Amino acid sequence: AELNAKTLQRLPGDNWRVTSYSGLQPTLTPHQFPRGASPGTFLHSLFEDLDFTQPVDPNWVREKLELGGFESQWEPVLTEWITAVLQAPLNETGVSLSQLSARNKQVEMEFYLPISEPLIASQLDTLIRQFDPLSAGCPPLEFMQVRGMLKGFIDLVFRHEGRYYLLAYKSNWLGEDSSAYTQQAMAAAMQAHRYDLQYQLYTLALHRYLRHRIADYDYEHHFGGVIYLFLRGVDKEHPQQGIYTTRPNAGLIALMDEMFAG
Amino acid sequence: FEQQLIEDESLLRYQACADFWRRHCYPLPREIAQVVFETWKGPQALLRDINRYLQGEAPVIKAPPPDDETLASRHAQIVARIDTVKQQWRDAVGELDALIESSGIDRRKFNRSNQAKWIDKISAWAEEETNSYQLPESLEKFTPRHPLFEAIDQLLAEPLSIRDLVITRALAEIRETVAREKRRRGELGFDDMLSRLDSALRSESGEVLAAAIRTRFPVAMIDEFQDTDPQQYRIFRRIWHHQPETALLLIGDPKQAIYAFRGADIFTYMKARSEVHAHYT
Amino acid sequence: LEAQEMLWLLQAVMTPERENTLRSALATSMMGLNALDIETLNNDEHAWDVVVEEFDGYRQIWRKRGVMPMLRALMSARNIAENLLATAGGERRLTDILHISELLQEAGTQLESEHALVRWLSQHILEPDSNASSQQMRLESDKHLVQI
Amino acid sequence: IVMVADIDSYSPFIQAVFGSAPADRYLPYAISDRRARQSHPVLEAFISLLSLPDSRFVSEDVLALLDVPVLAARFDITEEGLRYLRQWVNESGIRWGIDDDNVRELELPATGQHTWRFGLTRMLLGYAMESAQGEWQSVLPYDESSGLIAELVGHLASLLMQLNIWRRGLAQERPLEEWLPVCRDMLNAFFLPDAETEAAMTLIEQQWQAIIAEGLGAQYGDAVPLSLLRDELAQRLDQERISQRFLAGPVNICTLMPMRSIPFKVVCLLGMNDGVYPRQLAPLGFDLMSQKPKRGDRSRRDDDRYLFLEALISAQQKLYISYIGRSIQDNSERFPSVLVQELIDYIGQSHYLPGDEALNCDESEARVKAHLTCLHTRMPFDPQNYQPGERQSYAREWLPAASQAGKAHSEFVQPLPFTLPETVPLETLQRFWAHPVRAFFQMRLQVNFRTEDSEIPDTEPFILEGLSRYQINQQLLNALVEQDDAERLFRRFRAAGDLPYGAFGEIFWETQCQEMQQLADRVIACRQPGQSMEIDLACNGVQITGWLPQVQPDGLLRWRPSLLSVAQGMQLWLEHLVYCASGGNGESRLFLRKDGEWRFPPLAAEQALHYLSQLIEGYREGMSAPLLVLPESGGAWLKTCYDAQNDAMLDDDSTLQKARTKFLQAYEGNMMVRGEGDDIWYQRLWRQLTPETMEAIVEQSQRFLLPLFRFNQ
Amino acid sequence: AVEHKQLRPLDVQFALTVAGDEHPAVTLAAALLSHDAGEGHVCLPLSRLENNEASHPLLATCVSEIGELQNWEECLLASQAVSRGDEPTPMILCGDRLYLNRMWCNERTVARFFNEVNHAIEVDEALLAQTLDKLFPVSDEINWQKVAAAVALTRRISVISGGPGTGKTTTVAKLLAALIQMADGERCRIRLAAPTGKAAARLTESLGKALRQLPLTDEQKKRIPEDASTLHRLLGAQPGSQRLRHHAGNPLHLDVLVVDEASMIDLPMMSRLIDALPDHARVIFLGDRDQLASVEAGAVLGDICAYANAGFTAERARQLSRLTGTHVPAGTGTEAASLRDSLCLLQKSYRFGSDSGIGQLAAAINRGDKTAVKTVFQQDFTDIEKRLLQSGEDYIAMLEEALAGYGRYLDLLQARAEPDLIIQAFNEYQLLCALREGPFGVAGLNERIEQFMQQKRKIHRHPHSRWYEGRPVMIARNDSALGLFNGDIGIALDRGQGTRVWFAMPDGNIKSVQPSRLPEHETTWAMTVHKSQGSEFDHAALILPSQRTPVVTRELVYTAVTRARRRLSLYADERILSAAIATRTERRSGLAALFSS
């Protein structure tokens, strides 16, 4: 008997995917620390588990290095490097991390961001380059149309004197050993590693969270800025080296919210 | 509480047979290893011989060798038994008193000359066929006066074989090595569950465990009773023999017991029929 | 013989640079080629270039998608399933090929390496032990056959 | 959503049928709730390293550890080095046992051979001394590893020595405060840190330190054995499950997880047959909660029934249920679960078809349950699936296979163009008449079917059979043909481990020496010293150039430790034709085992050139078409039909039946002797021996193998 | 040496297995012997073991006998591992030099082949002189090629030592022509052997272009040598087993055998070639005396040609003067007349004379370093340039000079011309490095050249494709099915049908192969000196690392100088170039003592 096979007329499903930022992309010194993904996650876990109000205890650092499996000789340099990082303030007024209470801090905030429009890279990169000054170079990345949810993990959110602040940690820093980590080198690292889109999505997520939580919310009144902390670039004599403070122009956030909303 | 069942048990069985062949056949001298090679070429032929007895219930060996008799003692016993017949042939040589029959040819002394070529050393194991001409039961049918023919017939009455002692030592050693390896690895087998339940019900407190089975299921309907191992019927007699409030229904067919190669036995069904009183068809 | 043909095909897919294994695997009964086809394939260098290119594509599908996508693309591009079904007596061969493919896909998910499945297939060829899954099935149920 | 009762059993099939779709048919899938298997060649290798004193140190278990690239890169062993080490272990006689103390530890006698130390001493002696010198300490050297590549042996000896130390390290039971640096030292000793395997070693160290911390939190004082920690680590490494891609957007593949009900449009259920679902977990027996149940008690059976209820409620648009109903092995009926049976009973008792409005209650229930049940076909290429109607298959690749509109498999035999060259060597003719189908395959179209070598056996050779026995017999025959010392060759073969241990190897050597002496009493009975001569012939404008070894003035004398076969007779007949064509008056003799003898009388040069032209015509016919001349079965059929008394072939029916019986006996052998039909070169041409091809092979053997039995004496 | 102190695990396991429960002196001797066999030394003198070992008095406290074992010979003979050559022992001590049993067997086989089997084939001198006059046109002064051909056709076993560009293949062609013209009725099955397949292909194309130039006959063209075979292919070496087809029983049915490039022939391959030869074949060895050493352990050609500086014999000088008809000088003294008669030294180079600095630099390499400094210093002879490489700016200048060397290659690549001219332009300039990894090596220089081609707009490269247009590749393993051997270069480009790799066959054609059909492929912007042997380049550039390494020695710089036809560049320090000339790769062997008696 005669027979034929059916043919699918259209696509089975649209490009729906729940992704993250990674899917859209003398003898003892911190410069001589081994650079890798696992020491970076170990330093992130050390900065997550440690309390900022309590003073750093050397036996606790020794116990954490025993649990992690690193060398025991690095510990007395590690605790003084940690206290030198914590004593250095990272703000435009000079606010340190020890002034933040337990109610004010929030470590590792996980957010989901919805998007119903097809995310075109050409329509987004021009809107980024219109307001962001770091987009002078940095040719645009290529990614498919993402419609759905986007995952994100902010390192630290903290409030101070009635003003919210975001803080992220970067700890790879393989190519620098001297004091050359100035603002130009950190801006070049931000342009090379493409952390501008991650920081812009973090500002959009924090703006939407403060709009949903606090009624009658203003972006200029409550939000203060974004701080990036390079762990291997913090020096005792250089307060500006290691930290990187950037605040948006307060016009990109509303247009990005209108683009992601519909 | 947690164990790992193995589907194939031939690999560990071949490993234990190789261990037995290493620990038994290697330090033997030439006069014993010649007979061992005449019985089996290697451990694979021995495993092919005893593979139907290594699995399931170990059978009872009629007239087993004693535990202190080794291969060298049996070899020396057979060597002395052959040497006694050789001495009685060397003492009674050079004479013939039997009557000449029509079936008996006159070349038999040449066969005796073959026996003159036979008594040289005791390193061999297989005797000549001409001793079959020196049998009193065969010479009378074709007149035996000397008891040398009686000693020759006594020598040829039973087969001079080292095979039975090696088979008994293999059945004592290979199963124990397999159980030791599975107890070290923590694995279990299909017949190992039956052996564990039989050893549990064989103990003193385990009978109370059978009462717990009477707490668990106070009834039993057992289909295909022709394919029943004797360990299974021993378990079912341990649990549900004559205790009250429990029923036993053995549904089967003695005319369908065709799995005797696997481990089933119709004599267990005949024992079960002799034990019970009621029969239904 | 079908397990040995599948082993030769996996060796030709895994190592397509050496032409000896590819020529030994293309002349099997699974591909269904004549001696004149093998002679014209050995004479024409461009046809052998196309064969090496499509076998490299099969290797890329085998590394990116798995065993059964590569085997389905091989049975669809070469159209060997229709040729085995048109052949009298090839339905049993096709069912055995599909069962070997299912067993290789079942054993290939537990192994991350690509050569490990080929070594497992060579081991199971060298091991004639019979499991419950590794036995021969019934070739057809629609056509009535004399059952022994 | 698609939910299965057991995710790990069905997930290979799910991945196979979801990956194999083409680009127009591919839908994205995401499989969650599986057992976490991050890197199996790291975790399984560390488990095997933790089972090191309990291991038997078999050679395959060490080659499997060398298959891991981390353990190979730790001791600087490459993949080519592993490929050389495969044949170096397989040929030097390394079967089991790292050291002789390991053999004595297992209550086994110290043999001194077939161990890793014996193989290492053999390979180092082969690096030092050639194999032709002899034994040094009852160890024959291994002539393969001689140059710098034996430095890789120095890597392997760097491994097994470490495999001794932890064997003396992990034997004694240690308390929990001493097992801390053991895993770290084992990881930095056996493994090398890499970019990919760093997370696996970090997870191993984290699980080991977590086990030690949970043990030391209770302050355990007694000793802890190694196997308990190994089983605990093997249980803890497979305890993890991944669910990150559960609702990413692709279709979800996951097992049924309790207390998780999410609304979906399409809900599919797999593996709903009886026994598989509901998942039955037996109680511990001594638990008191199962004896007296309360309200808030939880059981796995009730959880699975509530999960089925949540899957029924959570389905919004469409509910799909599939179960194994028919067995794939014996075509036995497999009944579904009791939940699905109660569901279809409620459907049949609560609904009716509009065709039968008022017929019956049971008949309408059976008609509804038969209308809902879609019994699919056993094979995907069945034409019932492609029939137009309610259901139709979407597999476009199986459409021409189901339509049955394709060409059949044509015959492999085809007339190929072949021009006979001017200079054809004698070695080509010998390789042709040794096996004609193999010479048609591997030389004309250059297709040589390469079979993989056999695996290393798990034990020492107790008997001699196959290629090893033939090589021992060939070397013993070559030693006894010059009246050399057989005891020196016995010590040479015992020093290599090819002989059985103890008295059994002496018994085997004595019976093989008796057989080879019985053969050499016939071989050197008519042996004369002869040298190799050159052969240059011109037959039908075809040049034959070659060399004949050991040409005595009596004729041709060859000896091989084999049986009476037709291939060796064909080789001796070809040598006799190539010898008698240029001078050489005399017989040609070949002596096999069991009083086998091939003799050919001297013939004239004209008959020799005629038969050589016939063999040249057969050679040029075998290159165009596959020459179906079976040597063994065709020679058996011929010698059943030939009569040497009258020099004529018989034609009666009894000889025609006995020749067919001998042909069926020689083609397909018994369960102990490999027949001629069990060959990779003959199964490619035909799958079943048809009587037409049988008569063709009979005619070709009558055409070609007739002077083999005509001049036999 | 530095590597000799760091013991390999193979030597330690060999010392633990062979000695075992014996004295630690035997353990240290076995470890030192295994380390010297791994480094390439054939023999081990007992004076170095006695003097240059710190534990030598300590083992003097270890041994306790009647004679106290003061000598190393009695201490080795007391153990069961060292014998005099009678018992099957791994270590052999015969002439106060300890070696392994295989090395002792191969050394005695080489000494037997070069001391006893080399007899004098007596032929007609008048017809030989007539053929040498009708073949060699130069008869005004002393020509070393005519004397080499006469001494190769006179004796059975002859070694011809000569550098590149001296016309060795023309001498082999004249030798084979005089060999066929001498034996007319006698058949001659000439065979050619080579260590590598690429050198075999070069030998076949060179003898094809050389033998067709000379006028032959109808039967003389029938006896033309067909092809050159590999040494593993001529003897019949198997991949699995080491069993040869012509091992001991049946020799190769040959008349004369010409083995080209004997400098890359190690001692076991030489001993396997010797044992396969019959008692009537005449073997002619080719190669350079000062060339690089063999691949495996052993130095055959160097220890053979070390006696070439002494000269010929007094009777052999008169024999060569009667044969060639010219004035042949005699050598002073007589130590081994057969080996000194079988040797020959080629000094007249025809492709370059005294006006070119390449031959003067090659003559100054074997002399002191100040001779090489004086050769490079005055006026540079317009052929050799010296560039100092110390820092990053010198690295940039070296990359600029490499771009200026590869200028015609990039000009023919960008203009989209025929690939044959692209291959012919690429075969004129070549970089030669010593090591493999790091900043100074193969993979360092290749990645730096690819990064410089990515920086400057000369070569467009996709980062994820790995088969961009214009990459040079080379094959590492032989493949007789495709026709390419080890050491052949190919250029990947797009002819219009796709990106394919063009290879230049020695038959005059070009073959376009798919990159998926290539078994091996490595970037060859800079070749190693060991892998660039046999080939020739017009403009070579040596790059030496600043770190001291045992690879950079006198023979490496000698092979780097002779690799260049006309132009040669250097990138090295002054101290490294001064230390590499004095540090000669000497290999201790017993051939110096066996040939002296």
Side-chain angles (χ1 to χ4, degrees), chain B residues 53-65:
Chain B
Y53 310 110
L54 280 176
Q55 54 180 3
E57 171 65 34
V60 181
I61 299 105
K62 171 170 292 182

mmCIF file with all atom_site columns, all heavy atoms in Angstrom, chain B residues 53-65:
data_model
loop_
_atom_site.group_PDB
_atom_site.id
_atom_site.type_symbol
_atom_site.label_atom_id
_atom_site.label_alt_id
_atom_site.label_comp_id
_atom_site.label_asym_id
_atom_site.label_entity_id
_atom_site.label_seq_id
_atom_site.pdbx_PDB_ins_code
_atom_site.Cartn_x
_atom_site.Cartn_y
_atom_site.Cartn_z
_atom_site.occupancy
_atom_site.B_iso_or_equiv
_atom_site.pdbx_formal_charge
_atom_site.auth_seq_id
_atom_site.auth_comp_id
_atom_site.auth_asym_id
_atom_site.auth_atom_id
_atom_site.pdbx_PDB_model_num
ATOM 1  N N   . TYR B 1 53 ? 29.066 -30.096 39.950 1.00 0.00 ? 53 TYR B N   1
ATOM 2  C CA  . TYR B 1 53 ? 29.058 -30.356 41.383 1.00 0.00 ? 53 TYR B CA  1
ATOM 3  C C   . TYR B 1 53 ? 29.474 -29.151 42.217 1.00 0.00 ? 53 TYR B C   1
ATOM 4  O O   . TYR B 1 53 ? 29.147 -29.103 43.407 1.00 0.00 ? 53 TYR B O   1
ATOM 5  C CB  . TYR B 1 53 ? 29.982 -31.534 41.716 1.00 0.00 ? 53 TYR B CB  1
ATOM 6  C CG  . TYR B 1 53 ? 29.749 -32.759 40.861 1.00 0.00 ? 53 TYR B CG  1
ATOM 7  C CD1 . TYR B 1 53 ? 30.680 -33.150 39.906 1.00 0.00 ? 53 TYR B CD1 1
ATOM 8  C CD2 . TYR B 1 53 ? 28.602 -33.529 41.016 1.00 0.00 ? 53 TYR B CD2 1
ATOM 9  C CE1 . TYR B 1 53 ? 30.474 -34.274 39.123 1.00 0.00 ? 53 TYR B CE1 1
ATOM 10 C CE2 . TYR B 1 53 ? 28.385 -34.653 40.237 1.00 0.00 ? 53 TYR B CE2 1
ATOM 11 C CZ  . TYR B 1 53 ? 29.324 -35.020 39.293 1.00 0.00 ? 53 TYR B CZ  1
ATOM 12 O OH  . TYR B 1 53 ? 29.112 -36.138 38.519 1.00 0.00 ? 53 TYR B OH  1
ATOM 13 N N   . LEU B 1 54 ? 30.187 -28.187 41.627 1.00 0.00 ? 54 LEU B N   1
ATOM 14 C CA  . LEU B 1 54 ? 30.602 -27.011 42.384 1.00 0.00 ? 54 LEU B CA  1
ATOM 15 C C   . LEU B 1 54 ? 29.440 -26.063 42.648 1.00 0.00 ? 54 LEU B C   1
ATOM 16 O O   . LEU B 1 54 ? 29.439 -25.356 43.662 1.00 0.00 ? 54 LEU B O   1
ATOM 17 C CB  . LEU B 1 54 ? 31.724 -26.277 41.649 1.00 0.00 ? 54 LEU B CB  1
ATOM 18 C CG  . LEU B 1 54 ? 33.131 -26.856 41.802 1.00 0.00 ? 54 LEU B CG  1
ATOM 19 C CD1 . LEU B 1 54 ? 34.114 -26.085 40.939 1.00 0.00 ? 54 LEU B CD1 1
ATOM 20 C CD2 . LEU B 1 54 ? 33.564 -26.834 43.258 1.00 0.00 ? 54 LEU B CD2 1
ATOM 21 N N   . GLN B 1 55 ? 28.453 -26.025 41.758 1.00 0.00 ? 55 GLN B N   1
ATOM 22 C CA  . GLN B 1 55 ? 27.301 -25.155 41.934 1.00 0.00 ? 55 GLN B CA  1
ATOM 23 C C   . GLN B 1 55 ? 26.173 -25.899 42.638 1.00 0.00 ? 55 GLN B C   1
ATOM 24 O O   . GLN B 1 55 ? 26.022 -27.116 42.502 1.00 0.00 ? 55 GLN B O   1
ATOM 25 C CB  . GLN B 1 55 ? 26.818 -24.615 40.586 1.00 0.00 ? 55 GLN B CB  1
ATOM 26 C CG  . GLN B 1 55 ? 26.524 -25.686 39.548 1.00 0.00 ? 55 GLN B CG  1
ATOM 27 C CD  . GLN B 1 55 ? 26.054 -25.104 38.230 1.00 0.00 ? 55 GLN B CD  1
ATOM 28 O OE1 . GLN B 1 55 ? 25.986 -23.886 38.064 1.00 0.00 ? 55 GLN B OE1 1
ATOM 29 N NE2 . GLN B 1 55 ? 25.724 -25.974 37.283 1.00 0.00 ? 55 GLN B NE2 1
ATOM 30 N N   . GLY B 1 56 ? 25.384 -25.150 43.404 1.00 0.00 ? 56 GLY B N   1
ATOM 31 C CA  . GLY B 1 56 ? 24.276 -25.743 44.127 1.00 0.00 ? 56 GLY B CA  1
ATOM 32 C C   . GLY B 1 56 ? 24.728 -26.459 45.391 1.00 0.00 ? 56 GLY B C   1
ATOM 33 O O   . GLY B 1 56 ? 25.749 -26.127 45.996 1.00 0.00 ? 56 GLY B O   1
ATOM 34 N N   . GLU B 1 57 ? 23.946 -27.460 45.785 1.00 0.00 ? 57 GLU B N   1
ATOM 35 C CA  . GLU B 1 57 ? 24.251 -28.232 46.982 1.00 0.00 ? 57 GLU B CA  1
ATOM 36 C C   . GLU B 1 57 ? 25.378 -29.221 46.701 1.00 0.00 ? 57 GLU B C   1
ATOM 37 O O   . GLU B 1 57 ? 25.353 -29.937 45.695 1.00 0.00 ? 57 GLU B O   1
ATOM 38 C CB  . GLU B 1 57 ? 22.999 -28.967 47.465 1.00 0.00 ? 57 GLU B CB  1
ATOM 39 C CG  . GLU B 1 57 ? 23.233 -29.972 48.587 1.00 0.00 ? 57 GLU B CG  1
ATOM 40 C CD  . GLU B 1 57 ? 23.698 -29.324 49.878 1.00 0.00 ? 57 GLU B CD  1
ATOM 41 O OE1 . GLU B 1 57 ? 23.264 -28.191 50.173 1.00 0.00 ? 57 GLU B OE1 1
ATOM 42 O OE2 . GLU B 1 57 ? 24.501 -29.952 50.600 1.00 0.00 ? 57 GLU B OE2 1
ATOM 43 N N   . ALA B 1 58 ? 26.365 -29.253 47.588 1.00 0.00 ? 58 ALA B N   1
ATOM 44 C CA  . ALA B 1 58 ? 27.478 -30.185 47.453 1.00 0.00 ? 58 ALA B CA  1
ATOM 45 C C   . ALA B 1 58 ? 27.013 -31.600 47.773 1.00 0.00 ? 58 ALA B C   1
ATOM 46 O O   . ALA B 1 58 ? 26.461 -31.829 48.858 1.00 0.00 ? 58 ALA B O   1
ATOM 47 C CB  . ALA B 1 58 ? 28.624 -29.781 48.374 1.00 0.00 ? 58 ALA B CB  1
ATOM 48 N N   . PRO B 1 59 ? 27.206 -32.566 46.882 1.00 0.00 ? 59 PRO B N   1
ATOM 49 C CA  . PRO B 1 59 ? 26.709 -33.922 47.130 1.00 0.00 ? 59 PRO B CA  1
ATOM 50 C C   . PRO B 1 59 ? 27.611 -34.686 48.091 1.00 0.00 ? 59 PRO B C   1
ATOM 51 O O   . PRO B 1 59 ? 28.726 -34.275 48.413 1.00 0.00 ? 59 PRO B O   1
ATOM 52 C CB  . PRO B 1 59 ? 26.722 -34.555 45.737 1.00 0.00 ? 59 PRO B CB  1
ATOM 53 C CG  . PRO B 1 59 ? 27.841 -33.861 45.040 1.00 0.00 ? 59 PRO B CG  1
ATOM 54 C CD  . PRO B 1 59 ? 27.844 -32.445 45.559 1.00 0.00 ? 59 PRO B CD  1
ATOM 55 N N   . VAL B 1 60 ? 27.096 -35.822 48.549 1.00 0.00 ? 60 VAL B N   1
ATOM 56 C CA  . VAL B 1 60 ? 27.819 -36.700 49.461 1.00 0.00 ? 60 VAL B CA  1
ATOM 57 C C   . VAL B 1 60 ? 28.612 -37.709 48.643 1.00 0.00 ? 60 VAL B C   1
ATOM 58 O O   . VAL B 1 60 ? 28.050 -38.422 47.803 1.00 0.00 ? 60 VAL B O   1
ATOM 59 C CB  . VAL B 1 60 ? 26.853 -37.407 50.425 1.00 0.00 ? 60 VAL B CB  1
ATOM 60 C CG1 . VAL B 1 60 ? 27.620 -38.301 51.387 1.00 0.00 ? 60 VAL B CG1 1
ATOM 61 C CG2 . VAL B 1 60 ? 26.020 -36.387 51.186 1.00 0.00 ? 60 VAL B CG2 1
ATOM 62 N N   . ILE B 1 61 ? 29.918 -37.767 48.884 1.00 0.00 ? 61 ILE B N   1
ATOM 63 C CA  . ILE B 1 61 ? 30.803 -38.680 48.169 1.00 0.00 ? 61 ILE B CA  1
ATOM 64 C C   . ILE B 1 61 ? 30.820 -40.013 48.904 1.00 0.00 ? 61 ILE B C   1
ATOM 65 O O   . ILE B 1 61 ? 31.145 -40.071 50.096 1.00 0.00 ? 61 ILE B O   1
ATOM 66 C CB  . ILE B 1 61 ? 32.221 -38.100 48.046 1.00 0.00 ? 61 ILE B CB  1
ATOM 67 C CG1 . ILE B 1 61 ? 32.202 -36.789 47.254 1.00 0.00 ? 61 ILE B CG1 1
ATOM 68 C CG2 . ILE B 1 61 ? 33.154 -39.103 47.389 1.00 0.00 ? 61 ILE B CG2 1
ATOM 69 C CD1 . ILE B 1 61 ? 32.378 -35.548 48.108 1.00 0.00 ? 61 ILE B CD1 1
ATOM 70 N N   . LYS B 1 62 ? 30.466 -41.084 48.198 1.00 0.00 ? 62 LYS B N   1
ATOM 71 C CA  . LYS B 1 62 ? 30.498 -42.416 48.785 1.00 0.00 ? 62 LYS B CA  1
ATOM 72 C C   . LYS B 1 62 ? 31.939 -42.885 48.943 1.00 0.00 ? 62 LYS B C   1
ATOM 73 O O   . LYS B 1 62 ? 32.721 -42.847 47.986 1.00 0.00 ? 62 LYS B O   1
ATOM 74 C CB  . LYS B 1 62 ? 29.709 -43.398 47.921 1.00 0.00 ? 62 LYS B CB  1
ATOM 75 C CG  . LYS B 1 62 ? 29.856 -44.853 48.340 1.00 0.00 ? 62 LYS B CG  1
ATOM 76 C CD  . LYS B 1 62 ? 28.872 -45.749 47.608 1.00 0.00 ? 62 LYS B CD  1
ATOM 77 C CE  . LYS B 1 62 ? 27.446 -45.469 48.047 1.00 0.00 ? 62 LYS B CE  1
ATOM 78 N NZ  . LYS B 1 62 ? 26.468 -46.368 47.374 1.00 0.00 ? 62 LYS B NZ  1
ATOM 79 N N   . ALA B 1 63 ? 32.278 -43.335 50.164 1.00 0.00 ? 63 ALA B N   1
ATOM 80 C CA  . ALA B 1 63 ? 33.601 -43.768 50.615 1.00 0.00 ? 63 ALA B CA  1
ATOM 81 C C   . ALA B 1 63 ? 34.673 -42.720 50.329 1.00 0.00 ? 63 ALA B C   1
ATOM 82 O O   . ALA B 1 63 ? 35.504 -42.918 49.432 1.00 0.00 ? 63 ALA B O   1
ATOM 83 C CB  . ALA B 1 63 ? 33.984 -45.105 49.973 1.00 0.00 ? 63 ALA B CB  1
ATOM 84 N N   . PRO B 1 64 ? 34.693 -41.602 51.053 1.00 0.00 ? 64 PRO B N   1
ATOM 85 C CA  . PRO B 1 64 ? 35.668 -40.550 50.762 1.00 0.00 ? 64 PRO B CA  1
ATOM 86 C C   . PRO B 1 64 ? 37.041 -40.918 51.293 1.00 0.00 ? 64 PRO B C   1
ATOM 87 O O   . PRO B 1 64 ? 37.161 -41.756 52.199 1.00 0.00 ? 64 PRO B O   1
ATOM 88 C CB  . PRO B 1 64 ? 35.092 -39.332 51.499 1.00 0.00 ? 64 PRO B CB  1
ATOM 89 C CG  . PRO B 1 64 ? 34.403 -39.927 52.672 1.00 0.00 ? 64 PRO B CG  1
ATOM 90 C CD  . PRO B 1 64 ? 33.852 -41.258 52.216 1.00 0.00 ? 64 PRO B CD  1
ATOM 91 N N   . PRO B 1 65 ? 38.106 -40.332 50.739 1.00 0.00 ? 65 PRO B N   1
ATOM 92 C CA  . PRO B 1 65 ? 39.435 -40.564 51.296 1.00 0.00 ? 65 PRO B CA  1
ATOM 93 C C   . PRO B 1 65 ? 39.582 -39.864 52.642 1.00 0.00 ? 65 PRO B C   1
ATOM 94 O O   . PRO B 1 65 ? 38.886 -38.873 52.913 1.00 0.00 ? 65 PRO B O   1
ATOM 95 C CB  . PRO B 1 65 ? 40.378 -39.956 50.243 1.00 0.00 ? 65 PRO B CB  1
ATOM 96 C CG  . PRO B 1 65 ? 39.558 -39.864 48.996 1.00 0.00 ? 65 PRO B CG  1
ATOM 97 C CD  . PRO B 1 65 ? 38.167 -39.594 49.464 1.00 0.00 ? 65 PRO B CD  1
#
